[PDB]
Amino acid sequence: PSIKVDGKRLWNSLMEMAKIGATPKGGVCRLALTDLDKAGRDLIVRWAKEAGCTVTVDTMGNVFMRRAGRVADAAPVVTGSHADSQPTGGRFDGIYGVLGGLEVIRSLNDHGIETEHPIEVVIWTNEEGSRFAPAMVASGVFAGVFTLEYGLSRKDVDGKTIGEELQRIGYAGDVPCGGRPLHAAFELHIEQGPILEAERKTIGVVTDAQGQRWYEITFTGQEAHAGPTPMPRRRDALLGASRVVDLVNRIGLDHAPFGCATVGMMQVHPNSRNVIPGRVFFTVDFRHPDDAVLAQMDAALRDGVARIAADIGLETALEQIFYYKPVAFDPACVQAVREAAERFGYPHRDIVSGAGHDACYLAQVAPTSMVFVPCVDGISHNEVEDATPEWIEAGANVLLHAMLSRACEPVS
């Protein structure tokens, strides 16, 4: 508790990095493996080397900035996130975890603290998945989720592959991607949701990450005149789609407290006010921390959709387009985060990460958990994404002590 971070220095680094790719709306547009992403990586690498770090890059472009330990070859305690952003990205998504880890190294240097295990800060390539799909591809390769050839062959809209662009910006590293043991892993991140702010809690002790299932549904009925078409004989595709929306809501509430169910996207055809809609495309978003429950939500959706379609007379195309496994983070790492919050007197609570992060894939090959701070209005993936300096400072203090606790564990 005598060891604390320099909040102003960390805050200034975030304000500085937000200028690289700054958008007119006040956000950051630093797409993965662009010249702007190269600029942000190079600046972070420069700051890390100035703090005495040795830097390596792996074959997926992941950056490892290492602070030596007493046992130089012991498994590292690592932190990290992503430095790339969405086209409408905020100033704290991803970059906070990277710069928060940089501040951890600097604070340890300032207090002359030597750790048993070495400490690393990591930048993961293309977490956002916007310029290249899928998201989190590089931490996926590291964790064995994807093959290396798959990761390097992902193309953007212009046909450029990740491997080509890594070579172009000088981040085609020589270190093999994955297979290197890690003692512990932590990812510091803004919540991207409203829980911590609404409850006036400073730290979210992330215990789990949600599993996901994404769907695309099209109902096909018959477009017809809104007036003289008799009501019983109508095949209204929006009437069906509206009832699935309500069903999706019911399915989410039936699996509280952590179940999530949303219909976010809908397209009505022909979308003329005096035409019965003949076709409606829409999406379904399911999330739950338990995989077995999540599959029950899938079964209930498929069963309810077929029922709604049969009662009206609609044709149905239903496809699951995405699946993401639920993650239970490592208890020892979770306890280190909880104790760090406690030592500082930061009001905290256990929280499930509603979105996916590189920590979710990393958790499959290394003991991992996450640290959450609140964000203003729960806003993320928007240029107006915001957090207070006190929130920013508090999460870095928890990350500092969570890492120091596990990095000072004697080498068994």
Next chain:
Amino acid sequence: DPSIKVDGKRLWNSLMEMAKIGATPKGGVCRLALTDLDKAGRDLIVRWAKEAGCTVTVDTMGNVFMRRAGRVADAAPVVTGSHADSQPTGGRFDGIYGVLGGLEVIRSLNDHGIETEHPIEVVIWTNEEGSRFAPAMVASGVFAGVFTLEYGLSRKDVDGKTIGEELQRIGYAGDVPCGGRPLHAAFELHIEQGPILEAERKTIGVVTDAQGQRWYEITFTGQEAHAGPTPMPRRRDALLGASRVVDLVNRIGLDHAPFGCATVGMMQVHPNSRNVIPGRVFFTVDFRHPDDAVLAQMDAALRDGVARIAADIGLETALEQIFYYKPVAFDPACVQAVREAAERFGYPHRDIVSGAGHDACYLAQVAPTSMVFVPCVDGISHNEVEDATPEWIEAGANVLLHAMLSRACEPV
């Protein structure tokens, strides 16, 4: 006198020729009001009318008046006409049949060298469908004094373009004042857009009434947030609200069977991202009934259900009724003239209430007016498979021809 008849083949071919302008792959027409395709159809009709000896004027709402001179130069005209614009999923007969049928009336009179006491006019009414700019029948509404010219010209499409702007763009911003000119009589020929005449094996529908309508625009405002990290108890989903109003609207219609009509045809979800709870949804409501009191009961149920749905979720509501006209009883003498024409030709006929709104519904307020119906295949309209046989098309034009001659040969 039945020896005066229309040229069924010539009228049919004019319909097939117009169907090329905006032809869709399924065999319908996509010729939205005040588009370049709508302009093309207008120019072709004007050219055919001029070839038939008509003088053509265009008024301030873009209405086209094709005039056949009479013996009495100052007499009030007997007018017929419909609309040349279509739905996005429009058929080949909705609206255009009434225009081309009137053109065939002028040609048939020329073929038999018939001179009438009153002048005869065939009219194209602007943006009758009310799809691209809302509401329906706005141009005939301004003509009848129901709406002001400023209201008619300020109606906007989804891109903010007004009727007045688009009239100027396609060269149909006329100089003649809209309305204020006396009419001796008015008749509109149209397909039923319903199944009654086909089901009863009747050739002519003697339109005695048209049901009243009420159109609404509703915007629900909730809270846009990420579908993942936002827990279900903290949501204000605007699409959940709109979905329940769609079902409520369907319920209100079934509660007033057999003639109640209720539809949600248009919806716009914001931001419409699959992993974002919708924060705002705009949508429309279409209510119809032949009894004004029942139509008002449907209105009360809608406003009550909307407020209840909105309060249960936490949504803000903007609800505007943007269109309302009471049920119309057409002029008895004009109805009887239609009935008598069908009798003279031996066309099996029946009295019928119009399920859709037509420009004749507004014209009936300033001039003696009624309509002639022919059946359509499977009763379907506002679908590209909308169909009518050449026999139906020919028979309705013969009724229009003799109904119009009934009033046009009346001496001043």
